[PDB]
Amino acid sequence: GKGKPRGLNSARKLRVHRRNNRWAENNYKKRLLGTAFKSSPFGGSSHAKGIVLEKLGIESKQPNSAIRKCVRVQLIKNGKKVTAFVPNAGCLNFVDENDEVLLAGFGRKGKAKGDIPGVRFKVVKVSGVSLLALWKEKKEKP
Amino acid sequence: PRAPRTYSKTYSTPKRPYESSRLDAELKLAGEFGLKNKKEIYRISFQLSKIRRAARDLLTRDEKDPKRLFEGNALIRRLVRVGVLSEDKKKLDYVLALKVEDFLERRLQTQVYKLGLAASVHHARVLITQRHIAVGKQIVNIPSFMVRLDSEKHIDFAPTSPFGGARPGRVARRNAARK
Amino acid sequence: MENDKGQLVELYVPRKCSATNRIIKADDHASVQINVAKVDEEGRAIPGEYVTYALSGYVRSRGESDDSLNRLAQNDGLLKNVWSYSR
Amino acid sequence: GWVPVTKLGRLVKAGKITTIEEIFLHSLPVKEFQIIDTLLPGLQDEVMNIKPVQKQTRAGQRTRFKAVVVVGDSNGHVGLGIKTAKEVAGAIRAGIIIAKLSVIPIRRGYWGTNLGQPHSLATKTTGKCGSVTVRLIPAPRGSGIVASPAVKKLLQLAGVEDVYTQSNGKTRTLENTLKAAFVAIGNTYGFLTPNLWAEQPLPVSPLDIYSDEASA
RNA sequence: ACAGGGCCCAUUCGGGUCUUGUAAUUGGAAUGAGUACAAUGUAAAUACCUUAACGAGGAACAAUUGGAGGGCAAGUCUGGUGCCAGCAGCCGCGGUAAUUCCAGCUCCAAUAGCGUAUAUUAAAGUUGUUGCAGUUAAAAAGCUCGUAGUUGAACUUUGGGCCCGGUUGGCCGGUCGGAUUUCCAACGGGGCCUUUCCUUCUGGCUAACCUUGAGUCCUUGUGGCUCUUGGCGAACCAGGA
RNA sequence: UGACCCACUCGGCACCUUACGAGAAAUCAAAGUCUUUGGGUUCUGGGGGGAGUAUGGUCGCAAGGCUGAAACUUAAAGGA
Structure with missing residues (x-):
């Protein structure tokens, strides 16, 4: 006689005692307050527009040393101030201050990647022309 | 607005992606049967996986119930017409013991090969894309065709075609216009 | 177990404890099968002819067997007494 | 050479027993392994997992290389065993046998x-x-x-x-x-x-049917 | 021009005769990207398609972007630097011979297209109903009662009897590659009957044979359907109860 | 009658032994009948911290409880 009511008329007490439970399970937490719209940068999104400030330097977390390349942004929305991260080379160079940049996630949700600490985004485009190209030289910049 | 026109993909990919398991039985397929891309091994795979349940579905009606027989005897005769399964096997039952590999022989791609009119499997194909082969007096330009058993004997070469008629064929309006 | 057309299609038929019509599943060791015996009408052991019966492992563990046979060759047609279906 | 041991070995060398379905009927043991070599030859091997351990000595860490081996054919016959050993080349090997005494039907x-x-x-x-x-x-x-x-x-x-x-x-x-x-x-x-349920009726054990060959 | 990877002989050369190949001399052929008469196209042109004239020899008419420790294809090449420059999505290189940095040669991957950042997807059985985990990894409420919610033992025609027909599968192909009959398996399905609701009454409806007024083409006959008379109601109109 | 012995049973409170099974294992007659994936239903968790804090809302006289963030930071923290 495990812990649940079982007979026939035990609809009522079931549609409640899952709907309570669900709570805790983290996911169903995000989706009811859902956080996504109020908290976090993109709100209910995937991508966005921003414009750079400084070119900050963030060393490592440690089993590592690794002085990586990050940029503060200004979005073109809530305004948060965010940092974000660059790929490939130096990549830095090609992000010349107060330029237009196109930001996206980091495929991890929330969370925070690899050897970087409070950091949660990547730089996809600039000006809107790739980075991918303004490192495999299929275009160049204005 | 208008009747929004209706369409299902045929493909159903795999559940695990990579495997030196199943992989090195596609490349034993392609290959041996012509084909091209993996977007063939998986078309079929779907359409067998399609039929397969309409059996499962039945079997679980009783036997004898109207629906079960009708499809079976309508289901079956659809596969007798395409050569797929024999005469002698059709109880129902049994269509289940049909692996990928039976269907492939009844693709025009290869039925040409066997009707040799083709060096290897290849010379079996350009041979289809290039308007060359023909069923009635009618061209077909697509490897995946599926051989309807009672045609088969009517498989050509057409009037149009260069290998049975209307003219020599381009490269010949050249060896006769430089001596 | 069999086909459509009377073809026994199996590895074998399992042998089944003789008092307990469970099963004997390959690698039992515990495993016995008895070969008691009969007398001929005389202190002479009858040869090439005997009873049979077949213990699981099952019950070797539980004391059981001694009282299970003492049902059965009294229950068969040799022994007299010791045993009771009314305890 | 094979050679033999026990009453059960001797018999199958000679060949007073033929099939593996004798042996699961009376449900014998099995100690020797050749006992299913002569019989089932169909048999083929396969290596699943070669992992290091470890029992950790005073200035070091010992290691072996569990393998784990599966054997059989097609027809209702599986084999399975797990002999650690040190170095691979005992470790698989006298895995392969470990499995062979453990052949087991299926149904x-x-x-x-x-x-x-x-x-x-x-x-x-x-x-x-x-x-x-x-x-x-x-x-x-x-x-x-x-x-x-x-x-x-x-x-x-x-x-x-x-x-x-x-x-x-x-x-x-x-x-x-x-x-x-x-x-x-x-x-x-x-x-x-x-x-x-159709009650089958007990044959007679090999252990005293070919009692004399079975010994010196 | 050599180098060869074969072969036929090698009593030792080496040639050789079917072959790829490193070439820094090579010479005949081939085209359009661009240029451009005309026609075209176009309301009007540009372009396309056509095409006269032109136009391919490397210093052209020149193809790039990203890597070359691992993940992950591919340099334990040369040069500089010495935990400083710098790289590195993560593991990590760099503190005097750096397979990672700067750069030379060399190779690898995509290739008129590559990279880069962001968001989303699959990967994610790390949101899960199908498919998770909750003895200690992060998680069984302190324990019990409870209004909802949710689930809820079994029992109310089974069996048999006759029919008649479909359309898969055999056995004849019946024939100048499909038409169908007997032989005959599978399999559904309508009847009807065995104590058998079919909401059921007023007509019209009958549609079927319990009918049979006559009988017989032919295998010495439960193989074949032309015809009105008593009598089948659910093949169905249409008002109700 | 009662204590007792034994035979049997139903209900306990545990224990030994196996492992056919399960597991990361240590071990487990239940943590078994689960990729051959589904008897009934209530709670909970989804990297480590920040922190069961700050906040609001509430129960208490108070101690305090129940409810319960985020920014930021981080490549491990952990189990056997």
Whole structure:
């Protein structure tokens, strides 16, 4: 006689005692307050527009040393101030201050990647022309 | 607005992606049967996986119930017409013991090969894309065709075609216009 | 177990404890099968002819067997007494 | 040379016994291994997992290389064993034997629609080790071998061809997994369906039927 | 021009005769990207398609972007630097011979297209109903009662009897590759009857044979359907109860 | 009659032994009947911290409880 009511008329007490439970399970937490719209940068999104400030330097977390390349942004929305991260080379160079940049996630949700600490985004485009190209030289910049 | 026109993909990919398991039985397929891309091994795979349940579905009606027989005897005769399964096997039952590999022989791609009119499997194909082969007096330009058993004997070469008629064929309006 | 057309299609038929019509599943060791015996009408052991019966492992563990046979060759047609279906 | 040992060995060299289904009927032991070499030759091997341990000495860490080995053919015959050893070249090896004494039938059979030529099991079975639970289930025709790479493997060698599966069951334990699954197929035979009930009537044991050859 | 990877002989050369190949001399052929008469096209042109004239020899008419420890294809090449420059999505290189940095040669991958950042997807059985985990990894409420919610033992025609027909599968192909009959398996399905609701009454409706007024083409006959008369109601109109 | 012995049972409170099973294992007659994945239903968790804090809302006289963030930071923290 495990812990649940079982007979026939035990609809009522079931549609409640899952709907309570669900709570805790983290996911169903995000989706009811859902956080996504109020908290976090993109709100209910995937991508966005921003414009750079400084070119900050963030060393490592440690089993590592690794002085990586990050940029503060200004979005073109809530305004948060965010940092974000660059790929490939130096990549830095090609992000010349107060330029237009196109930001996206980091495929991890929330969370925070690899050897970087409070950091949660990547730089996809600039000006809107790739980075991918303004490192495999299929275009160049204005 | 208008009747929004209706369409299902045929493909159903795999559940695990990579495997030196199943992989090195596609490349034993392609290959041996012509084909091209993996977007063939998986078309079929779907359409067998399609039929397969309409059996499962039945079997679980009783036997004898109207629906079960009708499809079976309508289901079956659809596969007798395409050569797929024999005469002698059709109880129902049994269509289940049909692996990928039976269907492939009844693709025009290869039925040409066997009707040799083709060096290897290849010379079996350009041979289809290039308007060359023909069923009635009618061209077909697509490897995946599926051989309807009672045609088969009517498989050509057409009037149009260069290998049975209307003219020599381009490269010949050249060896006769430089001596 | 069999086909459509009377073809026994199996590895074998399992042998089944003789008092307990469970099963004997390959690698039992515990495993016995008895070969008691009969007398001929005389202190002479009858040869090439005997009873049979077949213990699981099952019950070797539980004391059981001694009282299970003492049902059965009294229950068969040799022994007299010791045993009771009314305890 | 083979050579022999025990009453059971001698017999099969000579060949007073023929098939493996003698031996699971009377349900013998098995100590020697050649005992199923002469018989089943069909037999083929397969290596699943070669992992290091470890028993950790005063200025070092000892190691072996569990292998774990599965053997059989197509026809209802699986083999399974697990001999650690040191270096691979005892470790597999006297795994391969470890499995061979553990050959075990199965009891391929019908889904429904009786038809002609066994493809699936007879019935639902389950197995348990520590954590894993395996729920093999009979599936109709070439449905498929519905499971992990490894289980597929086991189940091929043991044809068998088609059957649904499911786990529970930490099945990053390649070793406690197979342990289990194995203990279920080996247990098809250890499940009364109507078609057995017809009481069979005991043969006579080899241990005193060829009693004289069986000794010096 | 050599180098060869074969072969036929090698009593030792080496040639050789079917072959790829490193070439820094090579010479005949081939085209359009661009240029451009005309026609075209175009309301009007540009372009396309056509095409006279032109136009391919490397210093052209020149193809790039990203890497070359691992992940992950591919440099334990040369040069500089010495935990400083710098790289590195993560593991990590760099503190005097750096397979990672700067750069030379060399190779690898995509290739008129590559990279880069962001968001999303699959990967994710790390949101899960199918498919998770909750003895200690992060998780069984302190324990019990409870209004909802949710589930809820079994039992109320089974069996048998006759029909008649479909359309898969055999056995004849009946024939100048498909038409169908007997032989005959599978399999559905309508009847009807065995104590058998079919909401059921007023007509019209009958549609079927319990009918049979006559009988017989032909295998010495439960193989074949032309005809009105008593009598089948659910093949169905249409008002109700 | 009662204590007792034994035979049997139903209900306990545990224990030994196996492992056919399960597991990352240590071990487990339940953590078994789970990739052969599904008897009934209530709670909970989804990397480590920040922190069961700040906040609001509430029960208490108070101690305090129940409810319960985020920014930021980080490549491990952990189990056997």
